[PDB]
Ligand binder design. Sequence first.
Ligand SMILES: [Zn+2]
Length: 654
Amino acid sequence: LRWDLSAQQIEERTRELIEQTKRVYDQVGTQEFEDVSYESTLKALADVEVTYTVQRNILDFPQHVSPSKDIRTASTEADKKLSEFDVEMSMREDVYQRIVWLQEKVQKDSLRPEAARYLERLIKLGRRNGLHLPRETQENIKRIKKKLSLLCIDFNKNLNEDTTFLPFTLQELGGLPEDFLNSLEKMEDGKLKVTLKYPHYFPLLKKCHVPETRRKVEEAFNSRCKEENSAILKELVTLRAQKSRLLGFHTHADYVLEMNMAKTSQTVATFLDELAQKLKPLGEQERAVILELKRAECERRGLPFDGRIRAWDMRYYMNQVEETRYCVDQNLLKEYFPVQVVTHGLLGIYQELLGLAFHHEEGASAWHEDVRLYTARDAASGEVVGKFYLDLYPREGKYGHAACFGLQPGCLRQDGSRQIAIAAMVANFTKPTADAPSLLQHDEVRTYFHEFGHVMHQLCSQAEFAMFSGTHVETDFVEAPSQMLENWVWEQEPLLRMSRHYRTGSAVPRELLEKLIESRQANTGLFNLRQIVLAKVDQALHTQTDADPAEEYARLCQEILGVPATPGTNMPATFGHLAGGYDAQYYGYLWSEVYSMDMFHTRFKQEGVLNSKVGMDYRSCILRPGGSEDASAMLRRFLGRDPKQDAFLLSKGL
Ligand SMILES: [Zn+2]
């Protein structure tokens, strides 16, 4: 791939790519019925997607890793132009007509399965865009989409641009680290300025032992843009509902869910309700523990005790539970996880699990000197499967979160030969230095294992059509394979393969490993019940008509979480996911995680966590199809039955 492109070349290549690609769509869009064929219509569009995707990825990737701001800025602009172009092509009624004609002309069952799936998806995407509907319906949909887009931009911008802050004395900030306190904007008043941004909010609620301070900050944070965003949310709900009906669905949720593994809003509601019921007892147990800790602390500090867990007590006491009930010293633990050792052990586990051998391509071209390129080859034949880059250390201008970027999609070229997948994994682990090793927290090891899992999905998939390549699966299933893989960082054998004291070379003591593993369950009951409250609010707003966001959230917090929403607040008005493309899909996080445990326990825990036979079945049944098969079908084959919540519940001790 190309990595030495300047900002100017990016600009030029983008215009050229769009011109060349549009040329193909124009050709397809003007065919006469008589000339419509599999080769001239379906293959034409499938082939151009391959050439386009490759080029598009090269142009929009630099914005996330290039050390050059000019290149990054040009890449961001190219992404905007290409994204706009993608939507423009998706709405082409002329091209859609030829696809519909092809569907008519195509003899039933005469196409290869994946080709038939591709044709059906193209037809479905057009229908979800309303291209088959009457002009008046399409005009109305267009109008509503425009409004919705604007409403979403404001919802997010309002929250992001907010600069609300609360002044507190060093005494009121009791509990927060010293380095934290001096980082605040010291007012002439003498008080320190605490803003509602995450870097300030989370640490304060988890460490500040002054109840009134937590209370004030919680009220403010959960009341941000209350009036404006609640008005916007009411409009989003109504407009989404109308748009969904015009597109043929009874609710927005049902429209959104059609493409998910869950399929319908009823399926999601049943999923969430059953999960909440099963987790209830664990929630009761956890709140009892927290209430006692609060009673004890209030007594100890001479503070009044109201006998109730408040919204502003949650994060604080959950943190206390973790520190005094499970303990586990991350400071000591991290000494056994030097980044170099984790990388080696991690790559070792994946090699063995998938029957692969990773080969470092010394001195390969890259966007930064610290980037390393590897070629994954079949362990017995040595044939190339794919390639992947590792860009693990922080630097100015680089994406600040761990992620997997598909660069070259694994699929078939125009001539029928196979194009290998090429992906890049990004992380931001401190880079080892002279006398300052880079020790990883367990959560970083978890994130590392999770993201590399996506790299393997990208590389091991063998779809023939670019549309189904790699991680292009149902949104509520894409995370399941990686979440299944996270289980490895909670198992002793794999953990030992990824650890070693950075200095003494000693192995992690069994006592420490046991505690670490036990800590996985800390506060899991309340953590999940809260996620359920969020998922249910998301579902209610996109299935009901008169549902009031604040009231729904309050009702659910009391009934499911057991911790009341603070009067006057409106958490839903700050719930960015409702305006970030995840609308009606928040349940997806819980859905993938719950079933990922079924995948893990049913196959890997019974046949051998590091057994290659199971690993090869995982590669074959789950990764190889890419989006060429429905997640439900892949799971049924891998599990031998449909998935259940059982494994998840058992892992919680239920
Ligand atoms: Zn992920």
